[PDB]
Design a protein around this ligand. Sequence first.
Ligand SMILES: O=c1[nH]c(=O)c2nn[nH]c2[nH]1
Ligand SMILES: O=c1[nH]c(=O)c2nn[nH]c2[nH]1
Ligand SMILES: O=c1[nH]c(=O)c2nn[nH]c2[nH]1
Ligand SMILES: O=c1[nH]c(=O)c2nn[nH]c2[nH]1
Lengths: 287, 287, 287, 287
Amino acid sequence: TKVVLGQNQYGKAEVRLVKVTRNTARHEIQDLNVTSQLRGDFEAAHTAGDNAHVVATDTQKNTVYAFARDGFATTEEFLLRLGKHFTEGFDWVTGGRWAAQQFFWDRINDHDHAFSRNKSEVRTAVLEISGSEQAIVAGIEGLTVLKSTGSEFHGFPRDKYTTLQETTDRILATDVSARWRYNTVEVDFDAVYASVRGLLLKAFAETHSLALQQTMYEMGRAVIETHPEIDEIKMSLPNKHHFLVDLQPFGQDNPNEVFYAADRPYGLIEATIQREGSRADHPIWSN
Amino acid sequence: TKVVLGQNQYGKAEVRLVKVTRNTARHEIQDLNVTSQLRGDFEAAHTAGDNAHVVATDTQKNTVYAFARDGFATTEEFLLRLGKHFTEGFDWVTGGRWAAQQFFWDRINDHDHAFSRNKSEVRTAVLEISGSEQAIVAGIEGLTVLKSTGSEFHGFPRDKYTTLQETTDRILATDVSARWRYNTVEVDFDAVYASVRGLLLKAFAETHSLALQQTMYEMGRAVIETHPEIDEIKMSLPNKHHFLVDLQPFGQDNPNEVFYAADRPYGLIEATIQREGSRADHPIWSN
Amino acid sequence: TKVVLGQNQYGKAEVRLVKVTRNTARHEIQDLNVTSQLRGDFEAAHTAGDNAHVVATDTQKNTVYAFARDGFATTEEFLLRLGKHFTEGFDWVTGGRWAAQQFFWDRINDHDHAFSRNKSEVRTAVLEISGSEQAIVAGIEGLTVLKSTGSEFHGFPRDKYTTLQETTDRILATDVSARWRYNTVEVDFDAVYASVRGLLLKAFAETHSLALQQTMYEMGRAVIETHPEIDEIKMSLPNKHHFLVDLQPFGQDNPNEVFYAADRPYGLIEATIQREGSRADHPIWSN
Amino acid sequence: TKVVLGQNQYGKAEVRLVKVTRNTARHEIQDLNVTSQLRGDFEAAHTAGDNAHVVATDTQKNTVYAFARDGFATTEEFLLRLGKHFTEGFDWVTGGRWAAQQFFWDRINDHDHAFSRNKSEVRTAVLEISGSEQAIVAGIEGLTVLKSTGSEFHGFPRDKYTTLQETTDRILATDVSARWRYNTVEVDFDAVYASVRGLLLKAFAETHSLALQQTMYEMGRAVIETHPEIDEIKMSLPNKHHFLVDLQPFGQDNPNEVFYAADRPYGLIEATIQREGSRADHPIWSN
Ligand SMILES: O=c1[nH]c(=O)c2nn[nH]c2[nH]1
Ligand SMILES: O=c1[nH]c(=O)c2nn[nH]c2[nH]1
Ligand SMILES: O=c1[nH]c(=O)c2nn[nH]c2[nH]1
Ligand SMILES: O=c1[nH]c(=O)c2nn[nH]c2[nH]1
């Protein structure tokens, strides 16, 4: 009967940007996929078609490239400039969400302006501004890792639908997807990302696993303990199954050597590892 | 300081199920992509690696196939059965999230047991249980639509970054991605899905659009006004830009006929249309 | 010692074109993904960097839109016009390959200028010109089909590595990818495409299958037998495995009802069905 | 006219294999995506549904895992064993096509049994046996490269549809996809792959490009000149357009710094660089 406009946001999504730094003969590359969305009073825009407040998505796009011209130290700095620009520049704009993916490049044999793409991981950054407060969630994804041993899984409940055999030696493979919320913008974003990444890899590799849930916890723990600027870290880890193939039918044995890597289904272990006391329901996770 | 385990869930994702109903010569096909994750007391599993509370992801998988044997009338019904089984079947399991995608099939010339997949859209359903609380969200996705005319965009702000030219005749294309929350479990899930689908399509086509935002408001308004069982509908619509090519350099005009369909970037207009007085932020939207 | 430039071709790939026909209120849509590549004398371009013979890929792109202004009856007519233009327009250009994917759209409730995308199949066309001769291969792909019964596979040899069990009732699912070469350009492209599509569906559905190889064969024979303008048809059909799940461990039987749809690996059955006495090594299949 | 069965092949595609070598504490990882198809007399299987000659695809799959148990020095060596097995093992099987994608892994901090995926490239191998002949084509793909300068494109023809402007400084970006055919199986497969790779990257980075065509020619020539065992190298290089954004409308210049990385369309420059007098139509290039 009575309809009302609820939460809403709009902008330009996936603006691919490449910024070359060449004031010297030693060129640098910054490759981003930027998304800009504004929040505020767009009541008339939706219910009436009154675009008076609608800052064109096309215009948000231009702004991205226009700002890019000036250069940026980090992806987070670039995003902070955009968010500040749209919120302060417009009355009806009370905040928004600004995200970006960062793609890495490696010099080809230390060449000054020749590079090859490093596709082993993708860095993420998300800025959400709400009136007077703002927040930044950095992250990493697409980083596949695997232990060929040093992992077991047993002691789990056995109901009438349970057929999984316990084991003390299996492969543990997953795709590292983690995002951590900063409790301050005053952060050396590049140094932290590098450190967090190292901590994640280290924890995953050195922890004798009794379960993916356990490994993820240790991973989240190493980060929280190391960076005070980080309140919480959320991770989503798929248990990419590697089934030890049965070779007895062929007169052979399989001493944990030959595996079949199945695509689907896969186990999905997810959890938030937070700092005691820190918030437990930040609006930035609402997306 | 002190590290703590916050929110967390685990289970089996993307279990591909195909249920054939063949008690009669007229076979029926049900195609699903099912994901099952449990919520509860998994503290020890994460902190100490004690899996006494860890119902194997493999077991959740086996349960889906086992329960499929008995058949099911609707996707939502199927998910409801799994949710209650796990929550009730284990005391440390206080809830969870069970979602699925439903893929459609059409008979090959009305053949009794020969079909071809209809890929024009994908139906979704998500069930979330929190103690005694049960919430279901159904939706549609991958349904691309386009208006060759009956769409305009003008009256928007113009700053030093605005280049977009006002227009009273342009193409409006998008991928319909919608999800609505049911306020009751007693719903004719299939009838309502078809209805809502028709309402979204009808509103998209018939509304003389003055902005994607307006078309979306009308699409949702139609849904709420028609279905008492729905408290809100969320839509994420990309403005898939079709650029009218400039052929004047070659001496030809382009009477809104020849277009270049860009991939990225694209505008992304999102909004929530709800029944007045309905809950503002149900937890199911957090996932 | 002596390095040589062999086969080569270049151009613009994936030019997304949308042509709206609106001489009346009843609008029509033509959606294409065009790829144009030229062949001829480009020796100097590769060996010396002399671009005098290089009709820019950008130019080929502009040419697609420019020609699009005049409209076209079919996708094949459009490709024929392009190839002709590039081969006759440039002395050193002696040939090329012009391909296109055609995307289908359906009217939203018979609306005059609002449509929804039909993603159940994709039509393709390829034109190859070599000197004074030209050949056209049309096709369909992405059309997924499945028989819930009417399929068996037994009588295969057995060796020490064989474990597959015989069957007289299984699911037979595949993705229809078919490409047929015309032996003349004087063809009703649209009607033949609709016909072939129909013949492939009917043969797949009605043939009681003793193997995917046998089914694919009947599908090809029907095409060759029905259309004189077709010298040969090639098909690539994956055997999309649907494993009848073993429910015995859970105290249940599975009367051919519950299946697991595995992604990989999959059987891949391919063959060429030709008219007796027709070329078997046509260049168009090489590229 | 009468219908006939032309060229044909069948087998199991994309069998995902992971071979862990753990005779010592220093584990090794081989990760492949294998496809095996057979060629020979399968007339009866297609025309009659007589499967006596049909070595089950499931069986081909089993053989892959069984052979993997014995380990293999290289991907090529692995395909050769499979190929000889099926051709020599069955009188009616006269040949076939075996292919594989090899995925790379790097140790985590030189850890003995923990690794992370190097997704920056994918190695490929294809074996085709025709009687006693064994043809091997090795290749690389997914290797994205870019030059921020040292690339120009001018001197091209300006026909009635040419608007592209001449330039002496632009970004040159592509996805290195290359495949080279060995004239002998007596090859240190791993060493040549590393060399070839090095050669392709070097020629790309170090050549002052006057056109993608020129760059590609030098890449291929360096390979043909360096390795006597390679008869030819084919390359398919997309010109991934990075458009220098026009910021003048915003009162700023853009000294080759701010770019827009467009997805489609894109230039596609392909060519074959061979040893003078070598075969130019090897069957292996048709699949
Ligand atoms: O690490 C694991 N966690 C789980 O929850 C699980 N279920 N099956 N195997 C498993 N492995
Ligand atoms: O419908 C539209 N809404 C927007 O917000 C927008 N921005 N540019 N074009 C647009 N079109
Ligand atoms: O390197 C290039 N080769 C081409 O053929 C071309 N066409 N446009 N730009 C181009 N760049
Ligand atoms: O139809 C089939 N064809 C084959 O070649 C095969 N191999 N295993 N199962 C099979 N089924």
